[PDB]
Design an enzyme around this catalytic site. Structure first.
Site, PDB file in Angstrom:
ATOM      1  N   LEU A 104      15.424 -12.455  13.563  1.00 30.10           N
ATOM      2  CA  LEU A 104      14.009 -12.149  13.755  1.00 30.10           C
ATOM      3  C   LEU A 104      13.419 -12.920  14.935  1.00 30.10           C
ATOM      4  O   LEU A 104      12.507 -12.440  15.615  1.00 30.10           O
ATOM      5  CB  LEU A 104      13.225 -12.469  12.481  1.00 30.10           C
ATOM      6  N   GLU A 155      14.832 -13.603  17.681  1.00 33.27           N
ATOM      7  CA  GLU A 155      15.250 -13.004  18.939  1.00 33.27           C
ATOM      8  C   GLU A 155      14.271 -11.918  19.378  1.00 33.27           C
ATOM      9  O   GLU A 155      14.032 -11.752  20.575  1.00 33.27           O
ATOM     10  CB  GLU A 155      16.669 -12.443  18.820  1.00 33.27           C
ATOM     11  N   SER A 191      -0.308   0.083   6.324  1.00 36.25           N
ATOM     12  CA  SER A 191      -1.234   0.825   7.180  1.00 36.25           C
ATOM     13  C   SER A 191      -2.390  -0.063   7.648  1.00 36.25           C
ATOM     14  O   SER A 191      -2.703  -1.068   7.018  1.00 36.25           O
ATOM     15  CB  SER A 191      -1.805   2.026   6.426  1.00 36.25           C
ATOM     16  N   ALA A 193       1.213   3.726   2.303  1.00 35.48           N
ATOM     17  CA  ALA A 193       1.968   3.926   3.540  1.00 35.48           C
ATOM     18  C   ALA A 193       3.204   3.041   3.586  1.00 35.48           C
ATOM     19  O   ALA A 193       4.312   3.521   3.832  1.00 35.48           O
ATOM     20  CB  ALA A 193       1.092   3.652   4.750  1.00 35.48           C
ATOM     21  N   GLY A 229       0.804  -1.207   0.000  1.00 36.87           N
ATOM     22  CA  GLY A 229       0.000   0.000   0.000  1.00 36.87           C
ATOM     23  C   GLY A 229       0.842   1.264   0.000  1.00 36.87           C
ATOM     24  O   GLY A 229       2.068   1.208   0.068  1.00 36.87           O
TER      25      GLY A 229
HETATM   26  N1  GTP Z   1       2.956   7.640   8.229  1.00 39.16           N
HETATM   27  C1  GTP Z   1       2.405   7.542   7.026  1.00 39.16           C
HETATM   28  N2  GTP Z   1       1.072   7.213   6.918  1.00 39.16           N
HETATM   29  C2  GTP Z   1       0.500   7.103   5.700  1.00 39.16           C
HETATM   30  C3  GTP Z   1       1.236   7.326   4.545  1.00 39.16           C
HETATM   31  N3  GTP Z   1       0.403   7.155   3.488  1.00 39.16           N
HETATM   32  C4  GTP Z   1      -0.826   6.830   3.954  1.00 39.16           C
HETATM   33  N4  GTP Z   1      -0.780   6.809   5.324  1.00 39.16           N
HETATM   34  C5  GTP Z   1      -1.868   6.478   6.253  1.00 39.16           C
HETATM   35  O1  GTP Z   1      -2.435   5.257   5.817  1.00 39.16           O
HETATM   36  C6  GTP Z   1      -3.844   5.295   5.882  1.00 39.16           C
HETATM   37  C7  GTP Z   1      -4.439   5.109   4.489  1.00 39.16           C
HETATM   38  O2  GTP Z   1      -3.988   3.896   3.937  1.00 39.16           O
HETATM   39  P1  GTP Z   1      -3.077   3.907   2.615  1.00 39.16           P
HETATM   40  O3  GTP Z   1      -1.750   3.214   2.836  1.00 39.16           O
HETATM   41  O4  GTP Z   1      -2.875   5.338   2.181  1.00 39.16           O
HETATM   42  O5  GTP Z   1      -4.028   3.159   1.535  1.00 39.16           O
HETATM   43  P2  GTP Z   1      -3.629   1.799   0.769  1.00 39.16           P
HETATM   44  O6  GTP Z   1      -2.904   0.830   1.664  1.00 39.16           O
HETATM   45  O7  GTP Z   1      -2.808   2.143  -0.447  1.00 39.16           O
HETATM   46  O8  GTP Z   1      -5.000   1.102   0.305  1.00 39.16           O
HETATM   47  P3  GTP Z   1      -5.945   1.700  -0.856  1.00 39.16           P
HETATM   48  O9  GTP Z   1      -5.398   3.002  -1.398  1.00 39.16           O
HETATM   49  O10 GTP Z   1      -7.318   1.889  -0.248  1.00 39.16           O
HETATM   50  O11 GTP Z   1      -6.027   0.711  -1.989  1.00 39.16           O
HETATM   51  C8  GTP Z   1      -4.220   6.635   6.468  1.00 39.16           C
HETATM   52  O12 GTP Z   1      -4.510   6.449   7.833  1.00 39.16           O
HETATM   53  C9  GTP Z   1      -2.991   7.499   6.252  1.00 39.16           C
HETATM   54  O13 GTP Z   1      -2.831   8.486   7.246  1.00 39.16           O
HETATM   55  C10 GTP Z   1       2.585   7.659   4.650  1.00 39.16           C
HETATM   56  O14 GTP Z   1       3.263   7.856   3.647  1.00 39.16           O
HETATM   57  N5  GTP Z   1       3.164   7.770   5.895  1.00 39.16           N
END
Ligand code: GTP
Ligand code: GDP
Ligand code: CA
Ligand code: CA
Ligand code: CL
Ligand code: MG
Ligand code: MG
Ligand code: MG
Lengths: 53, 437, 258, 418
Positions: free
Chosen positions: B252, B254, B140, B12, B10
């Site tokens: 891992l 550990e 995420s 994040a 994803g």
């Molecule tokens: N810390 C951090 N949080 C992130 C980032 N990108 C998204 N998020 C968080 O992740 C959540 C959203 O999920 P995403 O990872 O963006 O979505 P995804 O996993 O790509 O899934 P879909 O887009 O629905 O297909 C939210 O709560 C965001 O605040 C990032 O680059 N850094």
């Protein structure tokens, strides 16, 4: 406060200090996925049927 | 030397992934094009950093990483970014159409389409491993891919690699940056499904990271870029032992052994210090005493909670920079007499300590200032269950009215899975309650 | 416009505090389960301290100290005074854990127990309400206030309330509270706390004060609800949420060098 | 999840659709010939969402122009950006629809619909990943109302798993063309409740009052009402046309905005008509809503705000968090954090900064009650029905539409008391 198991190398060291003593199978996953797939296909069938009506 | 393959799922996971590898490269003196001058064993070697990097005849160090996302725009940035040369195309997998912040869509609908391909691209990395330890999965709780596809992946990893260990870095949802109203649902759904398949998971609450950026880096409105760089640092500290010569958390397994007495209670709280602004004209460097003390300030934790009102099951100190044991002991000596540090009566109230003399590396043109010593503390406190409580409440509010539930059922899920996942979370909140009593 | 929530309707004290907040036209009461509040006059048991200080854009304050029950629980208090080195096994003012020789008021040849009200704000300032009360047995209100109990001492025993009793009381309060400060302070916490306490004392015939128990959800003497409650919002609530003397509280502070 | 297919139907539908394209064309640096002449490149970063790329770096709108009579579409082909549309994508009959829903849905429209779906199809087949369709139309006429909802039904059949989104102009006696508008509107609402995922309820009442009381235009023309509309349409689609993280496509928008499948009718709002505080107060007051409903008469299920221009993100978040904290009564307690905010650096034409509001409020029921009241006043006496029974329709069909919409209103009300 006892320091024990101290290990030293060129790039740091580690140790421990104590203060006071005291799975679903492959098939099993594909079925759930296909079970959901049919439920989708079914609902779509109900829709296209309703539209046909 | 046993290898470790990273999986970034994803936006994040991918975006956080890209930051950790930028950091690792800086730390292991690896250039964007992948060349590594200080490495003398060309196209081969079983050094500590080989657990994360492999070598090509041309002398290129290739991350043992796979990036996955059900949409290409984010991974496309890797394909064309500063480190495009680092990765090989097979490592970067993208779908066409994302999960729309829907667990059910990422897990069932779109997960089935892309799962086998992913496991293959991963298998290709596993085949090149002489002794694979296991995986580090970044994602995420709130995203549809991050939540829904990840748990599918985790289920299947436990099948295709039953003996290997699986660690987690999970981004826990915070409205200040959250992108969806249903992230509570996705969080519970992915936790319930992944629980048995994860040996150790480190939760990072965006709320906590957000404020730390504001409070300590004087950033008015933090972006993911700010958030991800602080997060990368904490992640680096945690994985450093696997990438550098040491004797603590060397594999891992550990992590599980030192931090996870009970399997289900595998969410260690992380606390990091010091975090200092780079745009800070004049700074006075913090001591071992001061930084080890900050580890017990909630304001520095990766999840906002109060350990004073819980029990510890384990605590682990990872220092980087100018540090030696005497100072740590003397710092711990003091801290004990000035804090409410209480362990479960059935555990030793001690601290496993690890020091890497190399001070933290920071990115050129970054918001973080260079320091001479820092520390990340991993502690398994029952207090982190507060985070499950917050989440379980939000989940209860929406589910009581079945709000948004149709989106999940529409993808082939069933109301049943909602209440199963919620009951399990009720168990988790009780297991913490007992241990913690 | 500050917003607050009420989750304890049996609270004699804070029900009156609520009235005052509404009476300043600058505080509005939300439904008990609306999370977008500044202040929570929370419930007595299972106060969800875990869901406070997690609302972006809101400074959140609650009227209870998480953990302060160690003091307010017979078994916990006793346990606390022993184990706690700062309190010590030593400490004259605490019974081994009955008084066969209590002080007596005349006429009536009667016993009693003193009640002092203490407010601890978010900064952990310790405030002692200048007004206490005595709960007396009219057998060999019943409510006795300080002015007259002070007058009695000046007559019967040729001394004052301040000297013979109030010095020890302030000492006991300061000792119990500053003892647990490291476990309950909300100094760098994501939410803030304040709390009104009720300390109960005894006085033996030698004019030595003794701690009975500590109540974390105390009521107040009928005519005092007005003055005390205004003080609660003055120094515990308006201090964190300012509006657009002669304090009724004695600030218990004492720093002896050694 | 990239390309959107735009369809505009009937006089109204084509008139607001024509402005929408003129407006966004401008924003994306496209001129009437289809050539790009922009200074920034955010203009081109998601240009594929609404435009195809033709030969010679020409961007052509993925738009389909529908009508049962030629007039309005001939008018478009002459207007400023008339040459920007693909000539093949003009699909029109000669008979017209006589402001009759039945003629649009059952007779005149049936005859024209396949040729439209042929165009819709070729637009789809060359989509790297179609996300769904957006239709513009009125609900009070015949073509846009009757044939438009006919189109929606057919499209859903051929694309059951894509998103259907509409901008639907609701009729009002204050800006009326015929007395049968309540019939046409009621019949359409029923189609919409079933066959769309998101519908922006654009009320001709609201639009008129705004032009008169606020803009101080003594006598507003359809052109004036369409100035507001095209501006709103610009704002609500900003998140799809420019780089963003919130409601960046049609599905994620729907997931965030629609907690129950039938309750997907939105109340748009725009400002100005200027500090971040001032933007945030206006966007939220009735007098900036494009649907004539009092939000203080209901509760918000969800809300999507969008700020445009160079401004302080910190102040935006302070102002957004403050509106909720200070009226937290009007946002339901059983959907935590139901207000999401986005910001885009590129402002609309002629403005330094603006804000667009999209609210799923339970007050929207007031709009459906009004129509239902008007509908019933005539239906009770079976007035004007012959125009419909003459096209094959039966009273039974009316009785159902009336009932299905009464339900819709009952649903909005039950969730306002939960
Ligand atoms: N810390 C951090 N949080 C992130 C980032 N990108 C998204 N998020 C968080 O992740 C959540 C959203 O999920 P995403 O990872 O963006 O979505 P995804 O996993 O790509 O899934 P879909 O887009 O629905 O297909 C939210 O709560 C965001 O605040 C990032 O680059 N850094
Ligand atoms: N806002 C707006 N409303 C319009 C416009 N043209 C027609 N309407 C409204 O739409 C309804 C008439 O439908 P219309 O689109 O003209 O008929 P159709 O071609 O058969 O669909 C009435 O409610 C009119 O008030 C327009 O240009 N702008
Ligand atoms: Ca090597
Ligand atoms: Ca004909
Ligand atoms: Cl294995
Ligand atoms: Mg994504
Ligand atoms: Mg009692
Ligand atoms: Mg007309």
């Amino acid at each position: 406060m006892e320091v024990i198991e101290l290990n030293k190398c060129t790039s740091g060291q580690s140790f421990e200090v104590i203060l006071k003593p005291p799975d679903p199978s492959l098939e099993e996953i594909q079925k759930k996925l296909e079970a959901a797939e049919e439920r989708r296909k079914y609902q779509e069938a109900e829709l296209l049927k309703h539209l046909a009506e | 030397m046993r290898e470790c393959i990273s999986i970034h799922v994803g936006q994040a996971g991918v975006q956080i992934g890209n930051a950790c590898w930028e950091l690792y490269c800086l730390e292991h003196g690896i250039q964007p094009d992948g060349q590594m001058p200080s490495d003398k064993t060309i196209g081969g070697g079983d050094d500590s950093f080989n657990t994360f990097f492999s070598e090509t005849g041309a002398g290129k160090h290739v991350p043992r990483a796979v990036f996955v996302d059900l949409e290409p725009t984010v991974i496309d940035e890797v394909r064309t970014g500063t480190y495009r040369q680092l990765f090989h195309p097979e490592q970067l997998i993208t779908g066409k159409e994302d999960a729309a912040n829907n667990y059910a869509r990422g897990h069932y609908t779109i997960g089935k389409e892309i799962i086998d391909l992913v496991l293959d691209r991963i298998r290709k990395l596993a085949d090149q491993c002489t002794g694979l330890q296991g995986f580090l999965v970044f994602h995420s709780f709130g995203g549809g891919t991050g939540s829904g596809f990840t748990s599918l992946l985790m289920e299947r990893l436990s099948v295709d690699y039953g003996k290997k260990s699986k660690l987690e870095f999970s981004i826990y949802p915070a409205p200040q940056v959250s992108t969806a109203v249903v992230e509570p649902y996705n969080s519970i759904l992915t936790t319930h499904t992944t629980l048995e398949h994860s040996d150790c998971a480190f939760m990072v609450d965006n709320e906590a990271i957000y404020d730390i950026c504001r409070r300590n880096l004087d950033i008015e409105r933090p972006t993911y870029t700010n958030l991800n760089r602080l997060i990368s640092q904490i992640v680096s500290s945690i994985t450093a032992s696997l990438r550098f010569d040491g004797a603590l958390n060397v594999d891992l397994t550990e992590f599980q052994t030192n931090l996870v007495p009970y399997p289900r209670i595998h969410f260690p709280l992380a606390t990091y210090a010091p975090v200092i602004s780079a745009e800070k004209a004049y700074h006075e460097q913090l001591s071992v005493a001061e930084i080890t003390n900050a580890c017990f300030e909630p304001a520095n934790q990766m999840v906002k909670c109060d350990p004073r009102h819980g029990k510890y099951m384990a605590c682990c100190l990872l220092y980087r920079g100018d540090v030696v044991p005497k100072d740590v002991n003397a710092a711990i000596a003091t801290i004990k007499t000035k804090r409410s540090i209480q362990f479960v009566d059935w555990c030793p109230t001690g601290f496993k300590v690890g020091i890497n003399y190399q001070p933290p590396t920071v990115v050129p043109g970054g918001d973080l200032a260079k320091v001479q010593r820092a520390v990340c503390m991993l502690s398994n406190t029952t207090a982190i269950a507060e985070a499950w409580a917050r989440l379980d409440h939000k989940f209860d509010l929406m589910y009581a009215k079945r709000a948004f539930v149709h989106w999940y059922v529409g993808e082939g899920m069933e109301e049943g899975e909602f209440s199963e996942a919620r009951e399990d979370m009720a168990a988790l909140e009780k297991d913490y309650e007992e241990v913690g009593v | 416009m500050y917003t607050f929530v009420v989750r304890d309707e049996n609270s004699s004290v804070y029900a009156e505090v609520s009235r005052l907040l509404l009476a300043t036209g600058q505080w509005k009461r939300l439904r008990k389960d609306n999370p977008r509040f500044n202040l929570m006059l929370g419930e007595r048991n299972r106060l969800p301290f875990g869901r406070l200080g997690h609302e972006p854009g809101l400074v959140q304050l609650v009227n209870y100290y998480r953990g302060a029950d160690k003091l307010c629980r017979k078994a916990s208090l006793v346990k606390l005074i022993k184990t706690s080195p700062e309190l010590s096994e030593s400490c004259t003012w605490f019974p081994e854990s009955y008084l066969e020789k209590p002080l007596l008021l005349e006429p009536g040849h009667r016993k009693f127990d003193i009640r002092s009200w203490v407010l601890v704000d978010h900064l952990y300032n310790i405030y002692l309400y200048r007004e206490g009360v005595l709960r007396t047995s009219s057998e060999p209100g019943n409510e006795m206030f300080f002015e007259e109990f002070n007058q009695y001492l000046m007559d019967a025993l040729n001394t004052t309330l301040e000297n013979s009793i109030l010095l020890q009381i302030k000492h006991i309060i300061r000792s119990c509270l500053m003892c647990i400060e490291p476990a309950i302070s909300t100094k760098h916490l994501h939410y803030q706390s304040f709390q009104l306490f009720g300390f109960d004392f005894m006085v033996d015939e030698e004019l030595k004060v003794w701690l009975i128990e500590v109540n974390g959800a105390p009521a107040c003497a009928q005519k005092l609800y007005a003055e005390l409650c205004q003080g609660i919002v003055d120094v515990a609530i308006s201090s964190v949420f300012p509006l657009a003397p002669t304090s009724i509280f004695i600030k218990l502070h004492h720093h002896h060098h050694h | 999840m990239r390309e959107i297919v735009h369809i505009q139907a009937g006089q109204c539908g084509n008139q607001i659709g024509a402005k929408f394209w003129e407006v966004i064309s401008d924003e994306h640096g496209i001129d009437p010939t289809g050539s790009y002449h922009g200074d920034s490149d955010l203009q081109l970063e998601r240009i594929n969402v609404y435009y195809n790329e033709a030969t010679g770096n020409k961007y052509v709108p993925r738009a389909i122009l529908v009508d049962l009579e030629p007039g309005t579409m001939d008018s478009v082909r002459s207007g400023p950006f008339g040459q920007i549309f693909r000539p093949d994508n003009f699909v029109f009959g000669q008979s017209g629809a006589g402001n009759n829903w039945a003629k649009g849905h059952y007779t005149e429209g049936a005859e024209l619909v396949d040729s439209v779906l042929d165009v819709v199809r070729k637009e789809s087949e060359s989509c790297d990943c179609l996300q769904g369709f957006q239709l513009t139309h009125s609900l009070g006429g015949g073509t846009g109302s009757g044939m438009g909802t006919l189109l929606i039904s057919k499209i859903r059949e051929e694309y059951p798993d894509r998103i259907m989104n509409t901008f639907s102009v609701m009729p009002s006696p204050k800006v009326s063309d015929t007395v049968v508008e309540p019939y046409n509107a009621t019949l359409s609402v029923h189609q919409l409740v079933e066959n769309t995922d998101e519908t922006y309820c654009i009320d001709n009442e609201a639009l008129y009052d705004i032009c008169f009381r606020t803009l101080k235009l003594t006598t507003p023309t359809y052109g004036d009402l369409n100035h507001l509309v095209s501006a709103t349409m610009s704002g609500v689609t900003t998140c799809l046309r420019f780089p963003g993280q919130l409601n960046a496509d049609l599905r994620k928008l729907a997931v965030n905005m629609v907690p129950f499948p039938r309750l997907h009718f939105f109340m748009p709002g725009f400002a100005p008509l200027l500090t971040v505080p001032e933007l945030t107060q206006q966007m939220f007051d009735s007098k900036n809503m494009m649907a004539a409903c009092d939000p203080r008469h209901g509760r918000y299920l969800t809300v999507a705000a969008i700020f445009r221009g160079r401004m302080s993100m910190k102040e935006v978040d302070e102002q957004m968090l403050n509106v909720q904290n200070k009226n937290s009564s009007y946002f339901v307690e059983w959907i935590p954090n139901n207000v999401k905010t986005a910001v885009c650096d590129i402002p609309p034409r002629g403005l330094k900064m603006s804000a667009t509001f999209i609210g799923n409020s339970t007050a929207i029921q007031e709009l459906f009650k009004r129509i239902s009241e008007q509908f019933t006043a005539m239906f009770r006496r079976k007035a004007f029905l012959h125009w419909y029974t003459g096209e094959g329709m039966d009273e039974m069909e009316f009785t159902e539409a009336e009932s299905n919409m009464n339900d819709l209103v009952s649903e909005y009300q039950q969730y306002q008391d939960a």
